[PDB]
A paper describes a structure:
Poxviruses (members of the Poxviridae family) are large double-stranded DNA viruses that replicate exclusively in the cytoplasm of the infected cell. The enzyme is a member of the DNA polymerase family B15 possessing DNA polymerase and 3′−5′ proofreading exonuclease activities. E9 alone was shown to be distributive under physiological conditions (adding fewer than 10 nucleotides per binding event) unless bound to its heterodimeric cofactor D4/A2012. A20 links both enzymes, and the DNA-binding properties of D4 are believed to increase the association of E9 with the genome template thus rendering the polymerase processive.
The end-joining reaction requires the 3′−5′exonuclease activity of E9 that degrades the extremities of dsDNA to create 5′-ssDNA overhangs. The published family B polymerase structures in complex with DNA oligonucleotides, with or without an incoming nucleotide mimicking elongation or editing modes, indicate that considerable domain movements occur upon DNA binding leading to a closure of the structure compared to the apo forms. We performed SAXS experiments using an isomorphous exominus mutant of E9 bound to a 29-mer DNA hairpin to check if the best model would be obtained by adjusting only the position of the thumb domain, or if a movement of each individual domain would be required. Complex formation was confirmed by the decrease of the radius of gyration from 3.83 to 3.45 nm upon DNA binding. The comparison of the SAXS curve of the E9exominus/DNA complex with the calculated scattering of different E9 models showed that when individual domains of E9 are adjusted, the theoretical curve fits better (and the χ2 is lower) than when only the thumb domain is adjusted supporting the generalized domain movements upon DNA binding.
Author numbering: -3 to 306, 314 to 900, 904 to 1005
Write the structure that this text describes.
Amino acid sequence: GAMDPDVRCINWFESHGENRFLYLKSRCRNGETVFIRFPHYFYYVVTDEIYQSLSPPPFNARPLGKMRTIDIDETISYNLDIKDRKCSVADMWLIEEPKKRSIQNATMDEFLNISWFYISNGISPDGCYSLDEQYLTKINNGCYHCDDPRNCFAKKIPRFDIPRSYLFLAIACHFDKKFPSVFINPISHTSYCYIDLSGKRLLFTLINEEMLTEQEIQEAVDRGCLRIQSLMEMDYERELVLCSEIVLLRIAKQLLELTFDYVVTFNGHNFDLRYITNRLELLTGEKIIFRSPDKKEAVHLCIYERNQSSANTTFHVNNNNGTIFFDLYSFIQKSEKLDSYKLDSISKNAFSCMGKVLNRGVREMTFIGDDTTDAKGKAAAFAKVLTTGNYVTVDEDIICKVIRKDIWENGFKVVLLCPTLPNDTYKLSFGKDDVDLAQMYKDYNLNIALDMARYCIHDACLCQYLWEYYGVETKTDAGASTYVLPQSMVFEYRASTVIKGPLLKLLLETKTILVRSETKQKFPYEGGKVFAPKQKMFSNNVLIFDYNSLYPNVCIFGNLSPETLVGVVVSTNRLEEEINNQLLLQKYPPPRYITVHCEPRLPNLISEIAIFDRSIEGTIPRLLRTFLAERARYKKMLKQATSSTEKAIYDSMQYTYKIVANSVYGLMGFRNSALYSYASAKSCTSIGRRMILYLESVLNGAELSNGMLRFANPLSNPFYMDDRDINPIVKTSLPIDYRFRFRSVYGDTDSVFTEIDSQDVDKSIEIAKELERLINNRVLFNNFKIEFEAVYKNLIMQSKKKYTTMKYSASSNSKSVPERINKGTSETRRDVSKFHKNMIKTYKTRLSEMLSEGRMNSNQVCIDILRSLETDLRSEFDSRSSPLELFMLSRMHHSNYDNPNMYLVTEYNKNNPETIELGERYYFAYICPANVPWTKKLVNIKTYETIIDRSFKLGSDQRIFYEVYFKRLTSEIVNLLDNKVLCISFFERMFGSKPTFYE
């Protein structure tokens, strides 16, 4: 009877009729659900003069107070005759209007109506409230109307936990050669994972009858499956249900129309749901129909798109019912930089564990994972995925089917269909059920249909596992709070729109309005600066130092904001450059003003100088100052919360403030943005560049002798004369007997790598921690800090994107287990041969020993190691002692989307007693006739690919086609090398071709 007045807001959404409304979906402590409706207004901000003049009066208005309005138009000056920035003060009004309205000179137009709703009425989109029932009037069961939200929502109350309902889903469409088209191909499967308010999971998968034999259908029934003839007969406690395609589609329709909190897919918005919807419209007449919670608006499901070049398109469902249709694909692209956005890749990363072996032999390994085996509850997470997973991937390579599983709350025992190399321990990776679908569909039978069902339910459940892993629920709520937006808009809108809420709040708080009175000219800060290490291979340890949030702190330091910019002073020749510099310094001295040299904006200017006044904190610096403070708060709250549900909330809030802070740099460069400021953006880049160069100049050739650190240049502030002791010789608390020497080896936009002449990681960590302290106390200034992240032993690196090293972190000691770090690569287990592996391992082991001698040019190493290669290469080409085993390579057999490999295995099967069946793992080598000499052309090496079965013996009139293996090997070797012109000569001489260089 009585409504629970204690509610937690969980989404907000709009109808769009001619008679339109805002709706809240909330949840009570019991679990009841309350929809509340609010009238829609369009908000306008006007000056008090405009307000007084208004044609008919506005529906309503509230004063905002006096506010300054500042012209932020950027202008260049060829001298120091720079006019003051236009700035007026007036009383402002927020006005409300039920119909749209053109008001000739209204201000603050860039900000969103919804943002004004929350701000004006004092409502947090993720808040809990004791609603004042006095201000609600019922209109359906469960749906109330609220004319006065400010009063109705007046009692905010602390957050209480709530339960939520989820539908995760996946489909499977038939195909042979082309991508599935709705006009011809039927849906074969629809799988669903339902999570109830209780926490109960319900799995069910609907199989399409019409792609099976009547005999087969009856087999399925006899085996366990429910068969059904209409929607009416569906029983959701049956995990497997056979039915017609139309029934299947009507079931989808019934489920998709329900008001789940979240309907979650992987690429469902562009494919799965689009497919269901069109295939339904085809076979029956029917539409999927969404209604507002008061039944006033009804829309047909219709996928729309949103676009954003820097770049990608995203797809969105138009439901008007409060359900969040959430596509993990789009979200994962937005929120993570990854090599692949395929679901098998994303799952591999997310779900792995360490497997201690319990049995061996037959064709069945066995593993256990638990707290003992890897890390606390990392097995627990793997175990959850195993409930529905049917293929584990051992040690990065060996794909293999599960045979049995035992699962408890903390661990899993799992027996797999693989080969054998039984060490005590191995790495287990999850992901899909890998297959050849196209073949399965070609040979379709009952056992395949059941396999596909197992496959398809797992893809649905992968969405819930990823949703857990990526913490989307709490990120949505955190986003809603921070961005002052509906939960459903958080990951739909782009970064230039989500920043506007907290910006609007700050402008209100600082009683400030920023107005651009002119077309912005075009250009953004483009440049494409990418970063090349001084050398690739490292004999010695490398110390890693990160600036802390460099661009946020740069903006704070410089007070860089479009309205704190006094002007830009440009020059076309050195006479103007010099007069202007000396006038600059008289008229705009430090520390009140900072002056920043920027890449000049026109090809004929030789200098460009931005001058910022630091006396009154600018808008952008203050926004950033807020976001860092908020982040700090939540990081503390995170460490004082102890309930894991709380940990999740504060960890999300913290993360959300990182992200939005880091959005600001790019937004200063983006012309369609409320934070655009060409000068500020450029000045931010430029101040950051200098902080990297300064740190590097000081550390490059620095030495430590006695207790003293001799920095390589004086510790002078690069922007202006400073209070600080610039003396570069500095007392350290280290051992007097230590004597070491430092080299600035690599640095990028916010990071600096320092080589120390030492391999003793224990000492290297001692020293870096001290280097950290002295850098922060003596080298740096104001809000610039570094932290020392890690030591990198055996660094081999090519860029920040492609590198390999043993990482010993700050927490680490000499003798704990490293973290093998690999980045950007593509090899191992039969991309490359044992000959290559053995050669590269020797040429590294010999090259690192050649750098510990210290006796080198770039060339005395380069010549010495290209000599050694020639000899070893000509020797193997002559002696020929290395077994064929050392040149074998592997591959999986499968059907096409690949094309010449079907021809290869076909012709082997067609010509040999044995068959390589369509899921088998076969070996191969590059073999040619023995009367071919050293060949400097190449062909399609493909013609010399030769399957090597157990019988195979190398022809007396055949040779291992050594050239292919050498050319790949010397390619890897010249990219370890630093001298480039030597390397390109060797590679034309030996192989008649030009090498690759991973740039």
